[PDB]
């Protein structure tokens, strides 16, 4: 389907608390979040607006992929425009740049 853009270059994830009463002031490491994401889900296909439930240190979070960038192997620079359309899909890699943003609730620190 994609032809060349088979890998995920940059992925943006909105993070929200599944339960409002479980808000925790704990400092969340984005590197640890990305490491857990790669460790638990490898070689999976993801699309924008796709939802996921993540269990990090016993804490349950709702993750929504707000946008995705698809790149082909051998592209030194990510000149491809970041696409918010659900058409674009990619394969997760151990080098994808994962950017975390606050969820619409804005409770995750």
């Amino acid at each position: 389907y994609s032809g060349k853009q088979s890998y995920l270059g940059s992925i943006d994830i909105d993070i929200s608390f599944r339960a409002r009463g479980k808000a925790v002031s704990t400092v969340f490491d984005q590197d640890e979040l990305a490491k857990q994401f790669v460790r638990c889900y490898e070689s999976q296909i993801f699309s924008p607006t796709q939802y996921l439930i993540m269990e990090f240190q016993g804490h349950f979070f709702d993750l929504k992929i707000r946008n995705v960038q698809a790149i082909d192997l051998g592209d030194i620079e990510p000149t491809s425009a970041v696409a918010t359309g659900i058409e674009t899909k990619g394969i997760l890699t151990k080098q994808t740049q994962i950017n975390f943003f606050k969820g619409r609730d804005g409770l995750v620190n």
Binding site: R18, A19, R20, G21, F60
Partner: protein
């Protein structure tokens, strides 16, 4: 049999009783199906509209007792779009509030909404049981949370 005789109102009464008992008996999906049948039979009749206003609510409640919040939301949307009276009815707002509370997993918010609904429209033992099972399901989710 009443339906086979085309006695719509008598079949509707029998189905109300059947759905009430089934929902009280743990058969939420079947009760919701019977409520859907009641809604379809009572649609377009000026005589049964409030029954409809309640029907939708009850159906949604059953779908929420079955932990199917998506089905409850679909029912709320269908009732709002199909019945103008239900769209502006307090039952629609209460059902939406319950759906939102279950979505956020806020049992206390659900209790507050129930108290607010009771303050203006008294709840019945059927609704009491349904919402009690729903709150205990939230507690069970809290157990699954560990």
């Amino acid at each position: 049999w009443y339906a086979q005789d085309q006695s719509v109102a008598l079949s509707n009464k029998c189905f109300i009783k059947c759905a009430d008992l089934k929902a009280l008996d743990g058969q939420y999906i079947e009760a919701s199906d019977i409520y859907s049948k009641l809604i379809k039979s009572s649609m377009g009749n000026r005589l049964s509209q409030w029954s409809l206003k309640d029907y939708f609510l009850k159906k949604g409640l059953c779908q929420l007792a079955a932990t199917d919040a998506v089905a409850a939301a679909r029912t709320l949307q269908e009732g709002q779009s199909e019945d103008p009276n239900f769209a502006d009815s307090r039952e629609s707002n209460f059902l939406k509030s319950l759906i939102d509370a279950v979505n956020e997993g806020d049992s206390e918010q659900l209790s507050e909404h129930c108290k607010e609904f009771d303050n203006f429209m008294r709840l019945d033992k059927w609704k009491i049981t349904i919402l009690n099972k729903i709150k205990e399901s939230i507690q069970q989710q809290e157990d699954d949370l560990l």
